Design a protein around this ligand. Structure first.
Ligand code: CD
Length: 46
């Protein structure tokens, strides 16, 4: 659980649905990357 996670939400649009690339940039396990998508309202619903 890194604060930089808040920063990832801002660029969530930049990574789009590719949470794997974001996880690689912040080096976080799928749990946090998926959680960030789960918070974004656009990447949540199709
Ligand atoms: Cd998003």
């Amino acid at each position: 659980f890194l604060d930089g996670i808040d920063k990832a939400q801002e660029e969530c649009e930049k990574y789009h649905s590719n949470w794997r690339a974001m996880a690689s940039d912040f080096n976080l396990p799928p749990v946090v990357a998926k959680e960030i998508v789960a918070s974004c309202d656009k990447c949540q619903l199709k």
